[PDB]
From a paper:
The cytosolic sulfotransferase (SULTs) family catalyzes the transfer of a sulfate group from the universal 3′-phosphoadenosine 5′-phosphosulfate (PAPS) donor to a wide variety of acceptor molecules bearing a hydroxyl or an amine group. Sulfonation results in inactivation of the majority of acceptors, including neurotransmitters, steroid hormones and drugs, thus modulating their biological activity and rendering the product more soluble and readily excretable. Of these, the SULT1 family is the largest and is responsible for the sulfonation of phenol, thyroid and steroid hormones, as well as a variety of xenobiotics and known drugs. For example, SULT1A1 displays substrate preference for small phenolic compounds, while SULT1E1 shows a preference for estrogen acceptors.
Finally, we determined the structure of the SULT1A1 D249G mutant that confers increased activity towards pNP and 3CyC, to highlight the importance of structural flexibility in tuning SULT1A1 transfer activity. To obtain deeper understanding of the structural differences between the D249G mutant and the WT protein, we determined the structure of the D249G mutant in complex with PAP and pNP (D249G-PAP-pNP). c The D249G mutation was generated on the background of the WT protein. We found that two mutations, namely D249G and Y240C, both located in the vicinity of the active site, can lead to substantial increases in catalytic activity with 3CyC and pNP at high substrate concentrations but lower affinity for these substrates. Structural analysis of the D249G mutant reveals an increase in the local flexibility of this region, resulting in a dramatic movement of His250 that can affect the SULT1A1 active site. The structural conservation of the His250 in many different SULT structures may highlight the importance of this region for controlling SULT catalytic activity. It is possible that the higher flexibility allows higher substrate turnover but reduces affinity due to changes in the active site. In accordance, electrostatic surface potential analysis of the D249G mutant relative to the WT enzyme indicates a dramatic change in charge distribution around the active site. These changes can lead to reduced affinity for the different acceptors due to possible differences in acceptor binding or effects on the dynamics and flexibility of SULT1A1.
Numbering used by the authors: 8 to 295
The structure:
Amino acid sequence: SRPPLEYVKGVPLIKYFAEALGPLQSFQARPDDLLISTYPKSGTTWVSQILDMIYQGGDLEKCHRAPIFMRVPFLEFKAPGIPSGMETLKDTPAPRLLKTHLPLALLPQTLLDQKVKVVYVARNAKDVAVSYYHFYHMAKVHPEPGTWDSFLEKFMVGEVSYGSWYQHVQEWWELSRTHPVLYLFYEDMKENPKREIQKILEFVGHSLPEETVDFMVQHTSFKEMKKNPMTNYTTVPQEFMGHSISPFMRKGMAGDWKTTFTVAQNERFDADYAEKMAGCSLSFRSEL
Ligand SMILES: Nc1ncnc2c1ncn2[C@@H]1O[C@H](COP(=O)(O)O)[C@@H](OP(=O)(O)O)[C@H]1O
Ligand SMILES: O=[N+]([O-])c1ccc(O)cc1
Ligand SMILES: O=[N+]([O-])c1ccc(O)cc1
């Protein structure tokens, strides 16, 4: 019933995920692992499904084996009456696709040392905040969200599960200068998914015929993913995720934060964002 966050090295975390970090210290990466890394609500499930269809040669018979959360072990995950990501990892064959939201301050150092390829997805802060707010309501391991205005204040000082968005997107953007990281944007995927799939294909070093890429484009669109039981999280216990409170596949839009942010909230957020992202080669689009 909505436990408080726990701080581990400056990072606020779901308490079961904090507990999960102990067993995870004995995780050993493989030169052929591939890590999907995002701040929450930035496109994790979307890119996981794309990467997993690439892994199965574009066939969809093969992606229905089990849910996405079984096919792509979530490193730090754990919950009551649900297998930890470390547990699920035991039964995952190489080459493995792995998922995390851990800041670099917590990331198993084995992944950097083994030079593990990373697919990093970033999304504009305002859509992430709105998506995160609704997520808190359905995903019951999170503390109480509160009102949207108070949730928004928490999001700006990084007092939410996994801490600061502004730091996450910046530190992984720096990492990409020195480590194999394909650094993607949710808004790009939204604008031209085929182009982004072709980018992911080239990073993992596969080629596919164009028909298979079109097939993948269709089967990873918001509407297909919303109705697919394997990707929409409807198979987990109600005590864990309340689908009738807010579906995991909620809207899938770039730019709809405008229907949630008030004008005062926007002005404050914009002033704060400019202090935080002061210098940056890194930039985001709020809208298409
Ligand atoms: N194939 C797809 N196309 C566009 N957005 C999708 C997507 N699959 C899921 N998403 C969206 O991405 C979000 C969740 O990201 P994550 O998988 O990292 O938790 C949600 O955003 P919204 O709440 O804005 O709808 C969700 O609806
Ligand atoms: O990541 N998740 O939300 C999960 C992960 C694994 C599981 O068995 C159920 C849900
Ligand atoms: O709290 N949860 O159950 C979560 C949190 C993050 C995520 O990527 C999936 C599941």
